[PDB]
Amino acid sequence: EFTKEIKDASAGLLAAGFIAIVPGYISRSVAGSYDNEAIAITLLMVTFMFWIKAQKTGSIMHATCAALFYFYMVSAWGGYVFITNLIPLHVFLLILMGRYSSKLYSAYTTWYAIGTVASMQIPFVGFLPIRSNDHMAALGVFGLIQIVAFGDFVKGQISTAKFKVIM
Amino acid sequence: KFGIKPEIHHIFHAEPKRVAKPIAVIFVLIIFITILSLIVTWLNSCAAAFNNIPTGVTAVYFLGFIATIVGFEVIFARYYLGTSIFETLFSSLYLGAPGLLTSTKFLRSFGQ
């Protein structure tokens, strides 16, 4: 489904056929292996699939069920931190390139809202996403996405010669 | 060696103080005055009032819609006081299955 969101589905079946039997994932996915990365990658790919599917169309629902599988990815594995430094790294690279839209706001800001009020309920991860140095990229991009939203309101309303002296 | 030994009583940790209570009462009715300011701003004063009410045969899907929206907050409000996660989960299942059909025929009935 992820590669179906990147290209046509005929590349999705190649990616599924690759990751079904690849030796890099079958190492940590052997038959007797209850070692907590058996459930991690099957939530990394559902998380990323609903994130890309939420950022294409700008839907609120796909970015809330991206955050439910983000929460259920936090409940499982301790390398959830990767996601909360990759989805903000994606959105931020969407800001520097000038590819901001209302879809990118309307996806990211509800991903951060639901996914950060929800991942705080696991007792191993307490108020750490408020005061850890690795969850600050998400609160930083959640910070400046407001400024790009309001600035994006004033750029499309005042003329270009006064708009060039703003950014 | 043998003989009597001095006692030990395990001096406990101190708990941080809670709050002065009428300060908390003051902020409770400040938030009450703010929410009542919101409702009194909505209903008549800013004229964002009830322009249309579907009094036809699609009124029952509107009352079903209010039954779902108020119903999930009744379920969550019961979950706030006791009421373990499984009985809440079957409660919102038994509301969410008939309730999603009568909250979608309504939004099919209104194209705005």
Partner: protein, 110 residues
């Protein structure tokens, strides 16, 4: 370069944009009083010196920040609609997102 044209001009565009569409009035005044509840809780944490539960503060605070977030994410879909998403599908997703945020914030208040 005093930016006197900015606040007056955007004041005319926004302040003209409010009463032409009756639903954006609901959205932005409800956003404004959400900002007032965030300010009231923040000055409660300033007025006394402790944040003693600290899950109650982030419960009552992240419900207001998150609800403001979902309201802006609906106003952006009513002002200029997204391609694959209708205006009625713009609203049910707000309802589902708001009910999920209300559940997690009533779980996090304990």
């Amino acid at each position: 370069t005093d930016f006197q044209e900015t606040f007056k001009t955007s004041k005319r565009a926004y302040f003209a944009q409010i009463e032409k569409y009756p639903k954006l009035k609901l959205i932005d005044t409800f956003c404004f009083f959400l900002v007032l509840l965030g300010v009231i809780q923040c000055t409660f944490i300033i007025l006394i010196r402790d944040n003693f539960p600290f899950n109650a503060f982030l419960a009552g605070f992240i419900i207001c920040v998150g609800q403001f977030v979902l309201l802006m994410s609906l106003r952006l879909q009513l002002c200029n609609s997204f391609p694959g998403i209708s205006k009625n599908r713009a609203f049910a997703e707000f309802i589902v997102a708001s009910l999920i945020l209300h559940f997690v914030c009533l779980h996090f208040i304990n």
